[PDB]
Design a protein around this ligand. Structure first.
Ligand SMILES: COc1cc(C#N)ccc1S(=O)(=O)Nc1ccc2c(c1)cc(C)c(=O)n2C
Length: 115
């Protein structure tokens, strides 16, 4: 598809730190530290976090919006799957899903006007 890549990517950049300002606890800023949680990789197939998303974006791994949205969702779904319901992590994830949802809804509308 033909849409101009460069405007799409700055859209993704802007969107990404809009997602990140919703994560006020900085819980999802960086990969889940295998240092503090050795078992994290046991049941979680594909880890994800905002810095890895930043890396993927700049490495041109996001060529459409749906893959960007899929990687955001992984962050939420990974966290709900690993942590028990009565954790700081789980509850902050519940709240990220709702608030991130709103951010993405608006960014998707803007991406759809491009191609
Ligand atoms: C930014 O790091 C932290 C932030 C807070 C707060 N508020 C508490 C501890 C750490 S920690 O780095 O000490 N440990 C840690 C352990 C498990 C984790 C995570 C972070 C992060 C996620 C998203 C996850 O799902 N899990 C299972």
């Amino acid at each position: 598809m033909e849409m101009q890549l460069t405007p799409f990517l700055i859209l993704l950049r802007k969107t990404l730190e809009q997602l990140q300002e919703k994560d006020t606890g900085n819980i999802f800023s960086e990969p889940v530290p295998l240092s503090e949680v050795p078992d994290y990789l046991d049941h979680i197939k594909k880890p994800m976090d905002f810095f890895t998303m930043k890396q993927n974006l700049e490495a041109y791994r996001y060529l459409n919006f749906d893959d960007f949205e899929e990687d955001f969702n992984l962050i939420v779904s990974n966290c709900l799957k690993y942590n028990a319901k009565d954790t700081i992590f789980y509850r902050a994830a519940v709240r990220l899903r709702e608030q991130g949802g709103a951010v993405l809804r608006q960014a998707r509308r803007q991406a759809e006007k491009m191609g």
